[PDB]
Amino acid sequence: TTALVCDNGSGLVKAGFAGDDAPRAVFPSIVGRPRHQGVMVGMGQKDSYVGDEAQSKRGILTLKYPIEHGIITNWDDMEKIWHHTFYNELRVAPEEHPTLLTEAPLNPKANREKMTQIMFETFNVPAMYVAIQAVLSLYASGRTTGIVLDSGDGVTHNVPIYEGYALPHAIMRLDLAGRDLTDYLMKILTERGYSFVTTAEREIVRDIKEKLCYVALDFENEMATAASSSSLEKSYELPDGQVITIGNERFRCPETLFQPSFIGMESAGIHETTYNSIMKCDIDIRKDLYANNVMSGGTTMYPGIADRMQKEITALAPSTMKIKIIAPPERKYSVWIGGSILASLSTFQQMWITKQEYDEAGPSIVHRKCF
Amino acid sequence: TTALVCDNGSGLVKAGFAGDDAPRAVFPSIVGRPRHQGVMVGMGQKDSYVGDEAQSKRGILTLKYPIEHGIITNWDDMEKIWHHTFYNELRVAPEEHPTLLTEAPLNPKANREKMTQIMFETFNVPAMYVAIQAVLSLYASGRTTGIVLDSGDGVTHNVPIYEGYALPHAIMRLDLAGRDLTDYLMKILTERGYSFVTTAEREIVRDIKEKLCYVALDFENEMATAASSSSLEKSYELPDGQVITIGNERFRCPETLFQPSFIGMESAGIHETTYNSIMKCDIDIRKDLYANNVMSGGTTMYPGIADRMQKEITALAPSTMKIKIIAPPERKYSVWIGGSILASLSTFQQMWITKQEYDEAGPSIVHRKCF
Amino acid sequence: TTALVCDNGSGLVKAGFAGDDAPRAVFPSIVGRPRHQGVMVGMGQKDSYVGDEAQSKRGILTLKYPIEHGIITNWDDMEKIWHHTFYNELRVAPEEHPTLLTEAPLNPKANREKMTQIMFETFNVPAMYVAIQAVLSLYASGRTTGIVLDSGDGVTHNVPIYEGYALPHAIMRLDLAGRDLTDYLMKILTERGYSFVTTAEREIVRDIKEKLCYVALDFENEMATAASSSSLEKSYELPDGQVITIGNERFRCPETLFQPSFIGMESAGIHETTYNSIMKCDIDIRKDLYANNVMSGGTTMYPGIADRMQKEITALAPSTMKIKIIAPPERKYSVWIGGSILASLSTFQQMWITKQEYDEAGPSIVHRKCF
Amino acid sequence: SSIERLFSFPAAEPKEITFLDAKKSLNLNIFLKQF
Amino acid sequence: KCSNEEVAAMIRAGDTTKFDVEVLKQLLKLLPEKHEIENLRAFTEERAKLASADHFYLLLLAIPCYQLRIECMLLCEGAAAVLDMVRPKAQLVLAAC
Amino acid sequence: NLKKLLETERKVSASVAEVQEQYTERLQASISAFRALDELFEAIEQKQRELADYLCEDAQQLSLEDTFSTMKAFRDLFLRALKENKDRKEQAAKAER
Amino acid sequence: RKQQLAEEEACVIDALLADIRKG
Ligand SMILES: Nc1ncnc2c1ncn2[C@@H]1O[C@H](COP(=O)(O)OP(=O)(O)O)[C@@H](O)[C@H]1O
Ligand SMILES: Nc1ncnc2c1ncn2[C@@H]1O[C@H](COP(=O)(O)OP(=O)(O)O)[C@@H](O)[C@H]1O
Ligand SMILES: Nc1ncnc2c1ncn2[C@@H]1O[C@H](COP(=O)(O)OP(=O)(O)O)[C@@H](O)[C@H]1O
Ligand SMILES: [Mg+2]
Ligand SMILES: [Mg+2]
Ligand SMILES: [Mg+2]
């Protein structure tokens, strides 16, 4: 019996079977509900739209994200997300397939309680397990030691592991990722004359952020270059046919990852978070940590981020260390791909939470069994 | 001339005159700096806030602690701490008053160097002395023999003294106290759903720890009692009006003092530190150490700690000894009080480090005069 | 059949065959257990690391020394140490090889009882002997008479021998050697700002002590020279890339051998122990103990110790008679070397404790067959 | 002139009436202190 | 962690990846003696019956003039280490003067 | 090391060509590098004699290590005096304030 | 030990890597 890997991220649900490069269902985690007066009768009008169907008809819908910063708020919407990704995207019964689920660290435990109760009572499985995303990222990296910076759409977390031993006191969580960058890009696109206020326009701002933005190596030199000459300005076409051109906003938007005070937040950037997570570890393993930095998630897909992060850590680390950052082209789905590693492992078959253990222990064995 | 006692704690500065019972200025040691953009011009917008002003305005301030584990890292901030506690709190000239200062044992010497240089050239006193906190706690206890556990905000240290003779090989230092308990409470309050990330919310988590937490007599029985029935759950009101309720975190938080492996430290607990500091002494005084366990500091102010501490030592000690924990009801300010008796001692007046001795011997006589 | 020599000291196990020049398996005696939570599954996570593997992987391990001041406290750990040094280091069968173990004098007898019983019933030999380390050091020196000062990692013991005759009433034991020097260096490196608290950091402080420290010829002049100018300061590189620079701690740390009051011990130094061991003997041999001061152990490997101890004994002895320290260049492994000559001696073959004699006499022959 | 200025040699309560001795009074003052 | 033929072929090839100073010092300290070589060439019977110790020495003696190769390989590695530690120090002394 | 490499080159040159074609280029590179190191040491001797005539010590009695240790301790005293004078000026400024 | 002496003298990775190429 093949297992299931379902990364339920804040932005994109990535679901599929065991042992694939791409997740079989990659779609944004949105539930659409109509906000206008339906005047035509019949023609297959639906009260809700999930996935790319909501993306297609987004002009006449209000889109809701059931997951915000790794914590699921609306649960009936999350049940609709799971029912759509089981019965329609993958078209398989949940009663005959074990399902590995991912989780951000330092998540509230009631979220684990409710996903265990819903997964064992609404979409009742033979077994399910709740795992950490950074461990799967280190699996997909193909190594054992190293520090992982995961950055999805709600959660950016740093986890250091040495020889298979994670350090739970050194795990750091930062609620700053691509949704906050999309909101900041909405805030700074208003400067050039372009207004985007609705939830349907969030997809357009996210598409602009995905296509045109990049990470600058030196911030102030790129400010001087953008202010002096318009060589950095690039164009984009909206679906209504309008043409926009952006300059410095190509590299002001991801800079909030390296400078969180742009959106008004006290905590430090991702390179200071990486460095402080390194120095919280014991002193002997740090040389192994500096040469094995791992980035995963879609937020580190800008084509300037590895050289900038190397420059910042080499500024922070002492000069006798080789700062090597692993930045594969496959790192957008590597959180899923290491889930293909762990679910296919022969040593993982005894660690699943079965139906019977849930039946004596209630929905509380998931704390003592998982991380 | 009346003397000054200024316990520069890691979390709270307690300063006041000699011959007084209660410390005159007890206030937290934080330097605030605004992190937002001020738009209203004028009306005395200070660039820094020190003390209770930083506490009252903490919602727009990044708060920095100048003292970390008894070692002063930022020195301009600690100069601002000394300027505030001399000029604003006590409202006295430092150049006409001797000033006893406190210190954790096994401190780096350059800290004592820079404190001696600042207190003799910036705030140039006639005389100053750098004492040890546990000796002052034994002064406030009124007895002469005993072993002192002092647990503050950064340093928990054990010093045994018999007939006024300390044993420097038996002094033990542990960098685990109330700030680590606060950060562990931040890590475990995320389980119930309450997120606290900024340094402004550190004062809220510290206030929750001060008001509601208590030391369990038996850990496993209290975990079973909290897991079975919700009678140990207690409520608290946040400043934004939200009501929280906590259960096992009332006694999981102070249990880190007895079990350091919660926050990833290899060291043993405070009871094993006390027992090893007793057994590092000579044999004939050990009985006199068993009946005089002096406990001081604000970390030992939970209302369950004396019975647990007696139980742990009685488990560790042989059965023919009367274990007696000396836990006074006003043990929070005992370091300052024993500084007040020591500053008012007639025999202590020849042991001051004067201005002339500093000018003759450089800033190095404090190694050769203090202990 | 060739014989085995295994100096199973407090710090370093030195084991090898008979008739060989250098000890083949030299490795420190530590048992390392993990203290963090292992999240990776598969690829052989062991629960106990012994030897060089515990040294390489020390950043996630608690290391325990099974031998403390020559007395084995934890016996399952010492069983694993013997298992590693037989099966994994030398790759030999102990059931077909005789074995000479080393032991400090004035050891508790039940320690020798348990060495005999575990060595004859877990790693059951044809024959095994327990020897005094100073006698083996005199075997390595190639002379019949002399006083031997041995100083390993736990025990510094003085034994004088004249014409083959050890005087048992003149043998002295002092529980002060390189582990206490390492712990004192951990105490005094905190003065310069460098904090070392874990068991893994003990190895780094031990590497600092092995690489940089030296015995001063005159202590007060060296303190004055280090206080005046920074010519005696030397730098070292930590595994995290930080560069330390130390001064007087290069020669304050080995001075505890000549001044035991630094760590609170009442007993006199090794020079007074050597002089009192000579003066406790009969008179006519004392001249022959002055010219043959044989040194051994790794603690006497500092490059200033022979001239210093010659100066101290020449101050102590009458001036009409020559003092000569016998300090070989290979005095680290001299206990093993003299064990290799004694194991290869033809006359020693009647002094083995055979298995038949052990079965007849119980575990009681080792009091009457050995020293 | 400044070297000559700096580095030159410099030019050269009611009476507590008691019927006890001092040692018993100080031992009682130590003894009454711990209460 | 490999067969003896790989060791003999790698000594014949002179590849210096996992042959440092100490392993070649150990290899020089175990050199095949005169009576050992004379006993090994006097063997006529089946090769597989003897021990691995004889097998390593016959695979080593198959190489013409093994000892010069082992010594110059050790001396080349040692000369590289001595050059890397002395030449920046000597340039630092000359620049200091 | 240079004497051992020259003896090694003489031993390889008397041996068979299979040793020679593999090892003579590494031996020649090591000998040339150590020869360049020997003229570097001769340049260090020339700068040592120029420094002994500079500092007016005897050429046979001057130790370069003692001179560099004197310069290191003097540079540490220079930096300590600079920091102490800067702190004295700063404390005088705050006293005037 | 005597009866032991008497009785003597007498893949995950390629499976997943094949199927990752199917997407
Ligand atoms: N090529 C790209 N360049 C820049 N940003 C991207 C790129 N691809 C995706 N992103 C952004 O990274 C975010 C994280 O993607 P993902 O980790 O799949 O989100 P989740 O899994 O939480 O739904 C997405 O919200 C997306 O906006
Ligand atoms: N009622 C209380 N219960 C538990 N902890 C307390 C209480 N009051 C204060 N504390 C803790 O004690 C600390 C103050 O200790 P303090 O006496 O100032 O020691 P120090 O002078 O070494 O800082 C504070 O950080 C706080 O966390
Ligand atoms: N080169 C050296 N210089 C100074 N001290 C050393 C040196 N080598 C070893 N030591 C110290 O001496 C000890 C080695 O002595 P040894 O007799 O081997 O101890 P053991 O046999 O108990 O392991 C080590 O604990 C180490 O601290
Ligand atoms: Mg994600
Ligand atoms: Mg205090
Ligand atoms: Mg020894």
Q: CA nearest B143 in D: which residue?
A: D34
Q: Is B117 touching F (CB cutoff 8 A)? A: yes
Contact C353, C365 (CB under 8 A): yes
The partner residues of B64 in beta bridges, in order of sequence, read B31
Q: Measured between beta carbons, which residues in chain F are less than 8 angstroms from residue C231?
A: 69, 72-73
Q: Measured between beta carbons, which residues in chain E are less than 8 angstroms from residue F34?
A: 79, 83
Is ligand 3 within 6 A of the CB of residue C27?
no
**Secondary structure in 3-state letters for chain C:** CCCEEEEECCCEEEEEECCCCCCCEEEECCEEEECCEECCCCCCCCCCEECHHHHHCHHHEEEECCEECCEECCHHHHHHHHHHHHHHHHCCCHHHCCEEEEECCCCCHHHHHHHHHHHHHCCCCCEEEEEEHHHHHHHHHCCCCEEEEEECCCCEEEEEEECCEECHHHCEEECCCHHHHHHHHHHHCCCCCCCCCCHHHHHHHHHHHHHHCCCCCCHHHHHHHHHHCCCCCEEEECCCCCEEEECCHHHHCHHHCCCHHHHCCCCCCHHHHHHHHHHCCCHHHHHHHHCCEEEECHHHHCCCHHHHHHHHHHHHCCCCCCCCEECCCCCCCHHHHHHHHHHCCCHHHHCCEEHHHHHHHHHHHHHHCCC
Cα A119 to ligand 4 centroid, rounded to whole Å: 20
Of C303, C145, C130, give the one whose Cα is nearest residue C210: C303
Residue E24 has φ and ψ, to the nearest 5°, of -75, -30
Tokens standing for F16? Answer: 């068979």
Nearest by CB to E72, which of F1, F27, F34? F27
Q: Measured between beta carbons, which residues in chain D are less than 8 angstroms from residue B142?
A: 33-35
Taking an 8 Å cut-off on Cβ atoms, the answer to whether B106 and C192 are in contact is no
Tokens standing for B125? Answer: 């006193």
Q: CB B15: neighbour CB atoms within 10 A? A: 24
Q: Is D34 touching B (CB cutoff 8 A)? A: yes
Rounded distance between C-alpha atoms, residue F46 and residue F55, angstroms = 14
Rounded distance between C-alpha atoms, residue B253 and residue B356, angstroms = 49
E97/chain F closest Cα distance in angstroms: 6
Rounded distance between C-alpha atoms, residue B266 and residue B264, angstroms = 7
Cα C92 to ligand 1 centroid, rounded to whole Å: 58
Rounded distance between C-alpha atoms, residue F94 and residue F88, angstroms = 10
Contact B131, B77 (CB under 8 A): no
Q: Is G16 touching A (CB cutoff 8 A)? A: yes
Q: Which residues of C touch B (CB under 8 A)?
A: 35-36, 62, 187, 190-193, 195, 197-199, 263-264
Q: Measured between beta carbons, which residues in chain F are less than 8 angstroms from residue B122?
A: 91, 94
Taking an 8 Å cut-off on Cβ atoms, the answer to whether G15 and A19 are in contact is yes
Cα B331 to ligand 5 centroid, rounded to whole Å: 11
Q: HSE-up of E31 (CA within 13 Å, CB side)? A: 13
Taking an 8 Å cut-off on Cβ atoms, the answer to whether E69 and F16 are in contact is no
Is ligand 3 within 6 A of the CB of residue C299?
yes
B53-69 core/surface letters (b: 16 or more CB in 10 A; e: else): bbbeebeebbbbbbbeb
C252/chain F closest Cα distance in angstroms: 21
Of C105, C205, C214, give the one whose Cα is nearest residue C155: C105
| Structural method | cryo-EM
Nearest by CB to B190, which of A108, A167, A261? A108
Diameter over CA atoms, chain D: 68
3-state secondary structure of A165: strand
Q: Which residues of F touch C (CB under 8 A)?
A: 69, 72-73, 76-77
Rounded distance between C-alpha atoms, residue A323 and residue A292, angstroms = 8
What DSSP element (H or E) covers A109? helix A109-121
Q: Measured between beta carbons, which residues in chain F are less than 8 angstroms from residue E68?
A: 8, 11-12, 15, 19
Cα A151 to ligand 5 centroid, rounded to whole Å: 41
Smallest CA separation from ligand 2 atom 10, residue? B298
Rounded distance between C-alpha atoms, residue A99 and residue A90, angstroms = 13
C81's CB contacts (< 8 A; 6+ apart) are C8, C13, C29, C31, C50, C66
Touch test F–C: 3 Cβ pairs or more under 8 Å: yes
Cα B299 to ligand 2 centroid, rounded to whole Å: 5
B126's CB contacts (< 8 A; 6+ apart) are B1, B95, B96, B97, B98, B354, B355
Rounded distance between C-alpha atoms, residue C188 and residue C194, angstroms = 9
In chain C, which residues are followed by a C-to-N distance beyond 2.5 Å, i.e. a gap?
A: none
Q: Which residues surround ligand 5, an ion (CB under 5 A)?
A: B 9, 152, 335
Dihedral sign of CA atoms C100, C102, C108, C110 in order: negative
Packed helices C270-279 and C305-316: angle between N→C axes, nearest 10 degrees: 50
Of C174, C120, C171, C66, give the one whose Cα is nearest residue C366: C120
Tokens standing for B179? Answer: 């700030």
What DSSP element (H or E) covers B243? strand B243-246
C147-185 core/surface letters (b: 16 or more CB in 10 A; e: else): bbbbbbbbbbbbbbbbeeebbeebbbbbbbbbbbbbebb
Taking an 8 Å cut-off on Cβ atoms, the answer to whether F94 and B117 are in contact is no
Rounded distance between C-alpha atoms, residue C250 and residue B55, angstroms = 47
The CA angle B150-B154-B158, to the nearest 5 degrees, is 25
Rounded distance between C-alpha atoms, residue A271 and residue A259, angstroms = 10
A348/chain C closest Cα distance in angstroms: 7
What DSSP element (H or E) covers A305? helix A305-316
3-state secondary structure of B236: strand
Strands B234-237 and A12-16: unpaired
Resolution, given in Å to one decimal, reads 3.0
Q: Measured between beta carbons, which residues in chain B are less than 8 angstroms from residue D13?
A: none
Alpha-carbon Rg for chain C in angstroms: 21
The partner residues of B173 in beta bridges, in order of sequence, read B157
Domains and CATH numbers, chain B: 1-27+70-134+334-370 (3.30.420.40), 28-69 (2.30.36.70), 135-181+271-333 (3.30.420.40), 182-270 (3.90.640.10)
The partner residues of B55 in beta bridges, in order of sequence, read none
A38's CB contacts (< 8 A; 6+ apart) are A45
Ligand nearest to the CA of C178: 3
Smallest CA separation from ligand 3 atom 5, residue? C210
Dihedral sign of CA atoms C186, C188, C189, C191 in order: positive
Taking an 8 Å cut-off on Cβ atoms, the answer to whether B110 and C263 are in contact is no
Rounded distance between C-alpha atoms, residue B62 and residue G23, angstroms = 48
Range list of H helices, A155-266: 178-189, 200-211, 219-228, 249-252, 255-258
Alpha-carbon Rg for chain A in angstroms: 22
F52/chain B closest Cα distance in angstroms: 37
Name all chains with 3 or more CB-CB pairs below 8 Å to chain A: B, C, G
Contact A150, A297 (CB under 8 A): yes
E65 Rama class: left (phi>0) / alpha (psi -120 to 50) / beta:
left
Tokens standing for B84? Answer: 């505030």
Q: CA nearest G15 in A: which residue?
A: A19
Q: Measured between beta carbons, which residues in chain A are less than 8 angstroms from residue B199?
A: 266
Taking an 8 Å cut-off on Cβ atoms, the answer to whether E71 and F64 are in contact is no
What DSSP element (H or E) covers A310? helix A305-316
What DSSP element (H or E) covers B294? strand B293-296
Rounded distance between C-alpha atoms, residue F7 and residue F54, angstroms = 40
Smallest CA separation from ligand 3 atom 21, residue? C9
Taking an 8 Å cut-off on Cβ atoms, the answer to whether A21 and G12 are in contact is no
Contact C354, C157 (CB under 8 A): no
Strands C127-132 and C353-354: antiparallel
Length of chain E: 97
What DSSP element (H or E) covers B165? strand B165-166
**Strands, sheet with B31-34, edge to edge from the N-terminal-most edge strand:** B49-50, B31-34, B61-64
Dihedral sign of CA atoms B161, B162, B164, B169 in order: negative
Contact C61, C34 (CB under 8 A): yes
Tell me which DSSP letter residue D9 carries.
Answer: P
Smallest CA separation from ligand 2 atom 4, residue? B210
Taking an 8 Å cut-off on Cβ atoms, the answer to whether C42 and A168 are in contact is no
The partner residues of A244 in beta bridges, in order of sequence, read A236
Taking an 8 Å cut-off on Cβ atoms, the answer to whether C231 and F73 are in contact is yes
Touch test F–E: 3 Cβ pairs or more under 8 Å: yes
Packed helices C199-212 and C178-188: angle between N→C axes, nearest 10 degrees: 100
Of A324, A327, A304, give the one whose Cα is nearest residue A217: A304
Strands A293-296 and A146-151: parallel
Tell me whether residue B140 is exposed, middle or buried, using C-beta atoms within 10 angstroms of its C-beta: 0 to 12, 13 to 18, 19 or more.
buried
A324/chain C closest Cα distance in angstroms: 15
Q: CA nearest A262 in B: which residue?
A: B36
Tokens standing for B308? Answer: 């647990």
CA of B8, closest atom in ligand 2: 21
Nearest by CB to C239, which of A284, A345, A351? A284
